[PDB]
């Protein structure tokens, strides 16, 4: 009833903030870059009992990489993430995906535009096209306002359990 979700993206993406929002409904305004990884369990309750994503909150910065691919081992699903306010961070997406499937031949994955809330967005939804041919889901999220906040988890869930009409629930 649980799974291992590697959480990749580059630096300042909002990976850490995202999961932490998810784990407390706090919002962290401070940038403190994760050093190596730091796996946070998470739980949602659903149509079919409870489910737990083991969020391997990986780093972004080259400096503090860690054992990167080493963390992806035995990954059952994922989330490359980027920041719609810095074009650069979408350009490295392809690399993250790379390293990822070079460890996980077939594992449900999700790509996430974050920061959709800054009203000076520099990654026009026009420009996001990657997932398509690499056949990953894509979602527009903000961790500052909870726009499409749980899409990434609900999707993966539907995939790993093999249930399309699996809806989350309050309890």
């Amino acid at each position: 009833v649980q799974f291992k979700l590697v959480l990749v993206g580059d630096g300042g993406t909002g990976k850490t903030t995202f999961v932490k929002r998810h784990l407390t409904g706090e919002f962290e305004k401070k940038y403190v870059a994760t050093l190596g990884v730091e796996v946070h369990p998470l739980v949602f309750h659903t149509n079919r009992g409870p489910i737990k994503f083991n969020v391997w909150d990986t780093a972004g910065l080259e400096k503090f990489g860690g054992l990167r691919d080493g963390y992806y081992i035995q990954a059952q699903c994922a989330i490359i993430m980027f920041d719609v306010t810095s074009r650069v961070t979408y350009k490295n997406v392809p690399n993250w995906h790379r390293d990822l499937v070079r460890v996980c031949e077939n594992i449900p994955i999700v790509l996430c535009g974050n920061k959709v809330d800054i009203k000076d967005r520099k990654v026009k939804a026009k420009s996001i096209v990657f997932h398509r041919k690499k056949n990953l889901q894509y979602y527009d999220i903000s961790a500052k306002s909870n726009y499409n906040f749980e899409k990434p988890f609900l999707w993966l869930a539907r995939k790993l359990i093999g249930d399309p009409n699996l809806e989350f629930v309050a309890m």
């Binding site: 630096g11 940038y31 979602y139 306002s145």
Partner: protein
């Protein structure tokens, strides 16, 4: 004793093999596991052998190992003992050889393999050409004997391929990539010759497929003759696509190929399309329901479907004038064009996005042919009218169907986000650019094009939909919402007169619909749609005022509606209608004597008494826009006073009571009230703009003294209880007044026709009230919005405020610097803001910087270095533009410039180089390069004064070349003096082409991360030595004119 770091001894394996299993399996201890394995990356890898050989969770543990090995190779390789280079070489080659063909390696996951293969790719990225010459050559034969060593070899070839064509941007220096390309290019035939071999003769499923896939990645670069002068495409269509498993790789390949530029290969593309389709028709029939086959189809067919989405869309999009120039292909593209429509009914707002990419492309193209309606009338002879333009004549029937699509699956026009501000505030939050809204707009575009191409058809359609809702019993909420959204899209895409007829018809029958239906769940949703529709057509409400009025009054009515959200519906609607039809509200209309606004104001309370906080705010913005119309300053004034008459009474009251007792401004309710009263005041000022000063003045000073009150009531609290006071009711509330106060002041200065006055009246009271107070606040209480409000209130005044940047920059500059100058974390706001502020005084007020103590000015630069050292991309980027800016602002003052160089120039170059060679700040790239670049340019002439100090025979050009080289050598001792000479001289060559200069910067970033070492001279020392010449011999073919 379970905590062991790893030094030398006869160092065991049964142990490490425990830490691994920890990190990957259990819990919080994993923190120290993970934290320890990061550290065995120090001295080296004399263990690599030790672990890899002597292998339960081995394969992990071996993994790790390979990581180390790989570090070793990616870098040290060069200065390795040559023989040991060989030792790895055969160590890996062999390791793979065995690890492949195994009576069970499915178990020994594709992992260990692929990372191993991956390593071999790494080695090759080092010597493949010069010191592995028989490689490709060999492994060919190496596969033609054994399938096992083959299947996998297809994968060596794959990764090699990506690594040298896809991901070589960044991971490799500029020239070494060129040399690996025309190297894979070179002997590619002997290996294409291989993949074919496989396809045509081998029957081993997995092998075949991993060759399709490895072919898929060949298709990004391989020369075109391999695709088109070969029976390849034929092999895929006839032989691989019709086949359930390879079904997909087959397509994706196709797709890729279908993406090239036909120039020379039109014949091949024609037959590839028709053939593909013979296949496809054979497979997924056209009488089949794609919607179910997806909803019900499993992942086996999901992707097939999405890749059809891509093959289709990308092809039709890139070979159209190819798919009509023959009466013979006309029927095939129709078949294909029909596929698109089926696929488009797919409930999957990501496939549908591809489909809609085509749809919109077509629409645009056939809008560029003719943007007009096929002149409606037959001809007097009866004949065909001949005015249908050459192309759409070919899609008429099918554009009818895409219109149907937009008006059926029309997307949600708006994206409201209920969600509560960082003040415990619960609000509605209107989003601007979201993948959502993008769906909306693109559908709108397509239906606007497809409306200009035959708007008679849109009208017709949208009426068959609405009919089918009233009686038609296609009735459902979702579908009604879609019908009226698509109605609201096509606004202004219709000859006015045309659309008068239209609307009246449409909504008339929707009022009829709304009576029909029993209930109030339905009566409301209907109504709401009527009101979007209606407010979507202000052209209409302007030519028909009796109606405008009627809709406004109805609006007001709904403003006491206690059914769900009907009230939010009404307010949105009213504010739309107020902004747009804003003029008719303040002028006298045929049918009555006195301007409608009047009645509205003379009735404010009775209209808006059943609203809640936000709703009333939005209402005040609403009548704002109206008062913003009346340009007659006398009446506009009278109107602004009676418009702000209700809140002003609250305010005036709270303000009497605060004379008598400045304690009530501590009263939780009366602050709830200074809050709401202000949110009003802000929206008001927003719609009203400049003349609103009449109001603002009225309270400005007092407002100030209360802002100043709350401020000192908060720091206090905070100072005596911790930042923790912030997370409680009243502090949050007070904060809110302060914020909405500053948002009031910036708000109004932001849109004022006058600078002089504002600077002379509304600025000096800020000083003591808001600025000095920010200084006097305790750090964890100083409001960040002060900085940003100051920032905004400097761009609007510029020169006028330049004389006071002393006074301001005092209150705030240093005191705030000290909050941002310990780490790069605490106080994120202050950081960002403070720096927008410095950005702006620098921009519009440089004279300031000119007239202050050299020690201060210095202090300002310093802070800027501090910006661009930031890891938060905004603080550092904003810091950069403040730098590039400031260099140029220096440029003007010939006087200050020179000295500026004689103190800071080199002392800036150190900082910028620092960041550039930092692995963290790589979004700087374009800014670093931009600045560094401009500065060297600058050097080659502009710096008229000697920095070395040995007179002129040590002229500056050569000086710099020198000190840069020295600076980098010493910070990077490994680089041979050659790598450095190369680079630095490339700083004055690539000098003017910053795309090129950027290229260069990265070139160097790779050079440092890898020990090039003595012997190795595969860095084509000279190749580029003349290469930069071609750059220098253009800067004067352009910049001498």
């Amino acid at each position: 004793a379970a905590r062991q770091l790893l030094d030398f001894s006869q160092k065991l394996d049964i142990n490490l093999l425990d830490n691994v299993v920890n990190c990957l399996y259990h819990g919080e201890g994993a923190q120290q596991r993970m934290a320890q394995e990061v550290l065995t990356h120090l001295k080296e890898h004399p263990d690599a052998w030790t672990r890899v050989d002597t292998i339960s969770q081995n394969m992990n543990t071996k993994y790790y190992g390979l990581q180390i090995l790989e570090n070793v190779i990616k870098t040290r390789w060069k200065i390795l003992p040559r023989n040991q280079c060989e030792g790895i070489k055969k160590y890996v080659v062999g390791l793979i050889i065995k690890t492949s063909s195994d009576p069970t390696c499915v178990e020994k996951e594709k992992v260990y393999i692929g990372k191993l293969n991956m390593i071999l790719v790494q080695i090759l990225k080092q010597e493949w050409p010069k010191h592995w010459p028989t490689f490709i050559s060999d492994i060919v034969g190496a596969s033609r004997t054994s399938e096992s060593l083959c299947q996998n070899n297809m994968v060596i070839l794959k990764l090699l391929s990506e690594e040298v064509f896809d991901f070589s941007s960044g991971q490799i220096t500029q020239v070494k990539a060129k040399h690996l390309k025309d190297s894979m290019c070179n002997e590619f035939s002997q290996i294409f010759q291989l993949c074919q071999f496989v396809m045509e003769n081998s029957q081993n499923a997995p092998l075949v497929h991993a060759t399709l896939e490895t072919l898929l990645r060949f298709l990004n670069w391989i020369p075109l003759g391999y695709i088109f002068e070969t029976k390849l495409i034929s092999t895929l269509i006839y032989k691989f696509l019709n086949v359930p498993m390879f079904r997909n790789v087959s397509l994706k390949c196709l797709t890729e190929i279908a993406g090239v530029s036909v120039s020379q290969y039109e014949e091949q593309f024609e037959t590839l399309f028709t053939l593909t389709m013979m296949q496809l028709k054979q497979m997924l029939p056209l009488n089949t329901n794609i919607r179910l086959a997806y909803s019900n189809g499993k992942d086996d067919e999901q992707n097939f479907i999405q890749n059809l989405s891509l093959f289709l869309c990308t092809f039709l999009k890139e070979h159209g004038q190819l798919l009509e120039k023959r009466l013979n292909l006309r029927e095939a593209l129709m078949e294909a064009l029909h596929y698109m429509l089926l696929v488009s009914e797919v409930e999957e707002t990501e496939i549908f996005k591809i489909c809609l990419e085509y749809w919109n492309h077509l629409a645009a193209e056939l809008y560029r042919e003719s943007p007009f309606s096929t002149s409606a009338s037959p001809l007097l002879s009866g004949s065909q009218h001949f005015d249908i333009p050459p192309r759409r004549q070919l899609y008429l029937t099918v554009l009818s169907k895409v219109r149907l699509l937009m008006v059926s699956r029309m997307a949600k026009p708006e994206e409201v986000l209920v969600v509560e501000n960082d003040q415990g505030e619960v609000v509605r939050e209107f989003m601007k650019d979201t993948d959502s809204i993008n769906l909306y707009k693109n559908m709108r575009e397509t239906l606007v094009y497809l409306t200009h191409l035959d708007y008679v058809d849109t009208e017709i359609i949208m009426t068959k939909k609405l009919q089918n809702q009233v009686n038609g019993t296609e009735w459902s909420w979702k579908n009604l919402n879609t019908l009226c959204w698509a109605i609201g899209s096509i606004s202004g895409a219709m000859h006015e007169e045309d659309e008068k007829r239209f609307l009246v018809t449409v909504i008339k029958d929707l009022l009829g619909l709304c009576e029909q239906k029993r209930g109030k769940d339905n009566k409301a949703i209907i109504a709401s749609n009527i009101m979007y529709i209606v407010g979507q057509y202000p052209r209409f409400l302007r030519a028909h005022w009796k109606f405008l009025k009627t809709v406004v009054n109805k609006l007001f009515e709904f403003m006491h509606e206690t059914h769900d959200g009907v009230q939010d519906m009404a307010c949105d609607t009213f504010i739309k209608i107020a902004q747009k039809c804003r003029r008719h509200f303040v002028q006298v209309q045929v049918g009555e004597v006195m301007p409608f606004i009047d009645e509205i104001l003379n009735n404010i309370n009775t209209i808006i008494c059943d609203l809640q906080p936000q709703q009333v705010h939005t209402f005040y913005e609403a009548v704002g826009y109206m008062i913003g119309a009346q340009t007659d300053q006398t009446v506009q004034e009278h109107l602004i006073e009676k418009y702000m008459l209700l809140p002003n009474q609250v305010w005036d009251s709270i303000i009497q009571q605060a004379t008598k007792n400045v304690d009530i401004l501590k009263d939780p309710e009366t602050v709830k009230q200074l809050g709401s009263i202000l949110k009003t005041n802000v929206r008001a000022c927003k719609a009203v703009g400049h003349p609103f000063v009449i109001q603002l003045g009225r309270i400005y000073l007092d407002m100030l003294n209360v802002y100043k009150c709350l401020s000192e009531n908060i720091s206090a609290a905070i100072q005596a209880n911790g930042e923790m006071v912030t997370k409680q009711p009243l502090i949050r509330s007070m904060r809110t007044v302060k914020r909405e106060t500053l948002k009031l002041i910036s708000g109004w200065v932001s849109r004022s026709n006058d600078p002089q006055m504002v600077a002379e009246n509304f600025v000096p009271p800020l000083l003591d009230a808001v600025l000095i107070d920010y200084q006097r606040n305790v750090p964890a209480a100083r409001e960040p919005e002060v900085l940003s409000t100051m920032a905004i209130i400097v761009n609007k005044l510029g020169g006028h405020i330049t004389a006071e940047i002393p006074q301001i920059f005092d209150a705030v500059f240093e005191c705030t610097l000290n909050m941002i100058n310990k780490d790069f974390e605490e106080y994120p706001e202050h950081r960002t803001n403070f720096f927008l502020l410095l950005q702006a005084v620098n921009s519009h007020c440089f004279p300031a910087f000119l007239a202050i103590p050299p020690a201060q000015f210095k202090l300002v630069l310093d802070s800027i270095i501090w910006a661009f050292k930031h890891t938060m991309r905004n603080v550092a980027d904003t810091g950069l533009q403040i730098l590039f800016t400031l260099l140029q602002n220096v440029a003007q003052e010939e006087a200050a410039a020179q000295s500026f160089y004689q103190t800071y120039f080199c002392d800036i170059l150190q900082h910028i180089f620092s960041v550039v060679t930092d692995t963290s700040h790589t979004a700087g790239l374009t800014m670093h390069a931009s600045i560094l670049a401009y500065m060297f340019n600058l050097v080659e002439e502009g710096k008229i004064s000697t920095p070395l100090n040995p007179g002129n025979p040590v002229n500056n050009q050569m000086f710099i070349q020198d000190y840069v080289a020295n600076l980098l050598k010493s910070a990077f001792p490994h680089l041979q003096d050659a790598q450095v000479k190369l680079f630095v001289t490339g700083l004055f060559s690539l000098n003017q082409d910053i795309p090129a200069f950027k290229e260069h910067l990265r070139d160097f970033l790779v050079q440092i991360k890898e020990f090039a070492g003595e012997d190795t001279s595969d860095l084509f020392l000279e190749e580029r030595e003349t290469a930069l010449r071609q750059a220098q011999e253009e800067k004067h073919k352009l910049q001498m004119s």
